[PDB]
Design a protein around this ligand. Structure first.
Ligand SMILES: OC[C@H]1O[C@H](O[C@H]2[C@H](O)[C@@H](O)[C@@H](O[C@H]3[C@H](O)[C@@H](O)[C@@H](O[C@H]4[C@H](O)[C@@H](O)[C@@H](O)O[C@@H]4CO)O[C@@H]3CO)O[C@@H]2CO)[C@H](O)[C@@H](O)[C@@H]1O
Length: 505
């Protein structure tokens, strides 16, 4: 005989101190008999909302606090309600990061802020300004080195520059974020992104530079500077680089403003062991010993627990972290933050690769950042249309034994006129409706080559949840369905296909 439900499963990102965390888990097991399994899946922050209640979902999820309001709004998180004496153990600033609509929705663990990390031998006096970096690169490259490499792919890393001269996410005033006032396309954001795009165009960094490339370059002494958070310090310690951690460079005289993240731990609403999860987080992790185990594996940054932060505060890398944090902004935790990040990610990549101007990239990002809720309405509409057409097609085929197809040389859904209350023309996600045969399937084509659908990451996820798998495709042959839509995929002005009838014998 054996038991089940005698284990806590924890998810935490791959760049954090998960082995240190597993040590805390071992102590918890020793006291309670409850096994603790730490995992670090890829894309855990995207995975969690689509498997939270399945039993493949974790009991505890770790991420920066910016992700948790969306989780909370979807009802995925247990409310956390620590006693007053426990709340007193942690900085009030950090509790603010995990408060959403008046309720605490996670435990705060540590304050993270990006810093400028520099090779003290190569560069004793790091630049105080972004503007002097092109020339510094020139000089260093005369010596077989580069000035600066950092992850250009994630907007977390480029945002400090974009925000420096005035860029912002959602307008904030008196405790509230205005989800229809977005600042990614103002003069400041433009100037910031233009500067980065020019750094690339003037050969001061490659547009494909990512995390592992930047890390490798700095830790092997090939570049004089990188931009990274506290988790990164471990690997540089083991390297031969003598490094400093310092203020980010200014842009147009203004400090760089990184988005400040609080590593946080949420408890799954569906967990059968919510109180044991609270015990683990409050009385095992959030102790000097618990945080030290994690911190010695990968540094946490400035921790939320006062007693242990007071020990860490003497470290100049921690003072630098707090300096950059105070010059930046705390991330909003609101549900719309995901939309913002996805929008800005695409804008920087498209601007950097020359696909769009800075203006068009940011113009589109501004719209996208503010579109999460309307995008839900657009998906709901297409689902309505699809349902109607599917029902009508099946009723038609039931009556006639014939498959309803849009005739040659025409378009639209006129063949189903008789079977529908109203004739759909174009989808709310864009694209004209058409009925086509693909092999022995009836397929609803939405859009044409020149004029297709547009879907965000979130819309595609929603579309798939509701319509199901093996229905939605981004390509067809003339005999088969091709590339299926995945919860991942972005779609940008492309044709979409949804199966209406699987088989005509
Ligand atoms: O399809 C594109 C990519 O989509 C997925 O990444 C998304 C995330 O799901 C979003 O949540 C968001 O990510 C933010 C993140 O929420 C925010 O905390 C911050 O992340 C920091 C983190 O705080 C820090 O501790 C450390 O881990 O580094 C992170 C940054 O690397 O900033 C992120 C934004 O850069 O937006 C991204 C899309 O950019 C998916 O994970 C990707 O694999 C996928 O390519």
């Amino acid at each position: 005989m054996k038991i089940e439900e005698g284990k806590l499963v924890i998810w935490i990102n791959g760049d954090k101190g998960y082995n240190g965390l597993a040590e805390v888990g071992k102590k918890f097991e020793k006291d309670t008999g409850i096994k603790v399994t730490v995992e670090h899946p890829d894309k855990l922050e995207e995975k969690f909302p689509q498997v939270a209640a399945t039993g493949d979902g974790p009991d505890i999820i770790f991420w920066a606090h910016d992700r948790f309001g969306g989780y909370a709004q979807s009802g995925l998180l247990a409310e956390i309600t620590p006693a007053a004496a426990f709340q007193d153990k942690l900085y009030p600033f950090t509790w603010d990061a995990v408060r959403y609509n008046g309720k605490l929705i996670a435990y705060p663990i540590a304050v993270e802020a990006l810093s400028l990390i520099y090779n003290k031998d190569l560069l004793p006096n790091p630049p105080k300004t972004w503007e002097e970096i092109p020339a510094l690169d020139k000089e260093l490259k005369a010596k077989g080195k580069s000035a600066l490499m950092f992850n250009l792919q994630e907007p977390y890393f480029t945002w400090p520059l974009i925000a420096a001269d005035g860029g912002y996410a959602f307008k904030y005033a008196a405790g509230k974020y205005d989800i229809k006032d977005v600042g990614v396309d103002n003069a400041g954001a433009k100037a910031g992104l233009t500067f980065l795009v020019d750094l690339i165009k003037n050969k001061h960094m490659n547009a494909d530079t990512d995390y592992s490339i930047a890390e490798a370059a700095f830790n092997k002494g090939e570049t004089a500077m990188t931009i990274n958070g506290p988790w990164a310090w471990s690997n540089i310690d083991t390297s031969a680089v003598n490094y400093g951690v310092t203020v980010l460079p200014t842009f147009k005289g203004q400090p760089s403003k990184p988005f400040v993240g609080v590593l946080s731990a949420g408890i799954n609403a569906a967990s059968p062991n919510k109180e044991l999860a609270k015990e683990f987080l409050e009385n095992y992790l959030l102790t000097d010993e618990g945080l030290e185990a994690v911190n010695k594996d990968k540094p946490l940054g400035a921790v939320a627990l006062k007693s242990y932060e007071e020990e860490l505060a003497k470290d100049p890398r921690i003072a630098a972290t707090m300096e950059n944090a105070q010059k930046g902004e705390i991330m909003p935790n609101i549900p719309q933050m995901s939309a913002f990040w996805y929008a800005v990610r695409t804008a920087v990549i498209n601007a950097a690769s020359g696909r769009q101007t800075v203006d068009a990239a940011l113009a589109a990002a501004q719209t996208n950042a503010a579109a999460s809720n309307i995008n839900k309405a657009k998906v709901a509409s297409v689902e309505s249309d699809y349902s109607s057409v599917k029902s009508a097609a099946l009723s038609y085929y039931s009556d006639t034994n014939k498959i309803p197809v849009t005739p040659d040389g025409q378009t639209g859904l006129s063949v189903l006129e008789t079977y529908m209350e109203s004739l759909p023309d174009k989808a709310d996600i864009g694209g004209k409706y058409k009925l086509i045969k693909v092999g022995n399937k009836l397929v609803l084509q939405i859009g044409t080559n020149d004029e297709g659908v547009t879907l965000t990451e979130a819309q595609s996820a929603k579309l798939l949840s509701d319509i199901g798998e093996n229905k939605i495709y981004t390509s067809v042959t003339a005999d088969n369905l091709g590339n299926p839509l995945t919860s991942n995929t972005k779609v940008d002005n492309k044709v979409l296909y949804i199966v209406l009838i699987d088989n005509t014998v």
